[PDB]
Ligand binder design. Structure first.
Ligand SMILES: CCCCCCc1nc(Cn2cnc3ccc(Cl)cc3c2=O)cs1
Ligand SMILES: CCCCCCc1nc(Cn2cnc3ccc(Cl)cc3c2=O)cs1
Lengths: 203, 203
């Protein structure tokens, strides 16, 4: 049984690219969703017996776990279109520290450099749905995956703030953390090259 | 006088893209090179009176300074081709912690998460030339900009270790740190859009 972790920031397209390739080499494959804020925390528990984690979160070295880059994905800073910072100019790019942020909470209470909130007005939530609910209600701003806000943006329910900070959205590495055992096994190298190559060939 | 900092990790192509655009709006423009390890340390001294810094290094918020992304650039982990880890397989991807790394030193003695060395066998140097000199002599491995190793790689003097960790080289954001004053001034927005757009249109 190969236990596999995908954080909720991972696009579900990318989730099918992984779930597919693994079944080629593997008989039993358990798939687990987690907050990006809970991914690395989870795999560090020996109980969880996680073998592969696919997360946007970064940590320099982990016990018993190697890192590598599967690919890249986009994130946007979003707010209610009527939200004060709608003009999205460079004064708003610094004003975020002053306005309320809807940030992902972590069970572990702690946050990485990456997922730590930027403002002092912070309101924690377990997932991106709770986040964008509160953001649709002008309660604050937040950083969510592209696939979570693709719909609402065209439907005018949400606006972007990030385009001056980083045009085209915020490029974000998807890391593959894998148990050191797998580093030898060909079936794992298969998964890497396949998954990787299948996201190059899927924009 | 507009004081502008570019770390040595910034490609010199990208350096001409900046040096060009600024002269359109600005009369006096001082250009300063620095170790990526010394960039953010430098701009935090009030004496330095730096207005714009272009560096790969990251820090969440700085006093009096806003962040944004000008673009992306590539880095490789390189070694002498005869270096033990030449086979570049996934056991070598974890063995780096055991082999000697030629890491950039910082005057400030401190390092960011990004530029902190990975191994315990570390030998510090001031610049990428000292690094790749020692690396050509099989003394250890190091992470250098693409433009620093483009030559030596084709000329077989150096080999890559990174391609399993991150095929195509290690994607690296180039940040623009700018004094909060500039956030309003149109001439600065000019520089952003121009510099940015000129690196989209220069691969
Ligand atoms: C005008 C300032 C805008 C920059 C906001 C500060 C940033 N934060 C980050 C880390 N970060 C966080 N939350 C995510 C959620 C989802 C996804 Cl897909 C990515 C990410 C992410 O990269 C980068 S950029
Ligand atoms: C098999 C493990 C290989 C990963 C090595 C660990 C990394 N380190 C980093 C940060 N880092 C550092 N030094 C640079 C120098 C020059 C340039 Cl252009 C970039 C960078 C850089 O990103 C990322 S990846």
């Amino acid at each position: 049984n190969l236990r596999v972790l995908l954080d909720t920031a991972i696009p579900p397209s990318f989730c099918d690219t992984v779930s597919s390739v693994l079944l080629d080499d593997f008989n039993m494959v358990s798939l687990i969703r987690t907050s990006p804020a809970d991914s690395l925390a989870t795999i560090k528990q020996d109980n969880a017996e996680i073998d592969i984690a696919i997360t946007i979160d970064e940590e320099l070295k982990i016990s018993r776990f190697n890192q590598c880059v599967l690919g890249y994905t986009k994130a946007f800073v979003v707010a209610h279109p009527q939200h004060p910072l709608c003009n999205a100019s460079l004064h708003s790019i610094a004003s975020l520290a002053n306005y309320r942020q809807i940030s992902l909470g972590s069970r572990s209470g702690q946050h990485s450099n990456l997922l730590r909130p930027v403002s002092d007005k912070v309101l924690f939530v377990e997932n991106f749905d709770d986040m964008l609910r509160l953001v649709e209600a002008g309660v604050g701003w937040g950083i969510a995956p592209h696939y979570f806000v693709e719909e609402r943006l065209r439907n005018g329910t949400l606006a972007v703030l990030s385009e001056l900070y980083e045009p085209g959205g915020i490029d974000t590495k998807v890391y593959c953390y894998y148990n050191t055992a797998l580093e030898s096994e060909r079936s794992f190298l298969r998964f890497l090259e396949s998954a990787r190559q299948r996201l190059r060939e899927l924009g």
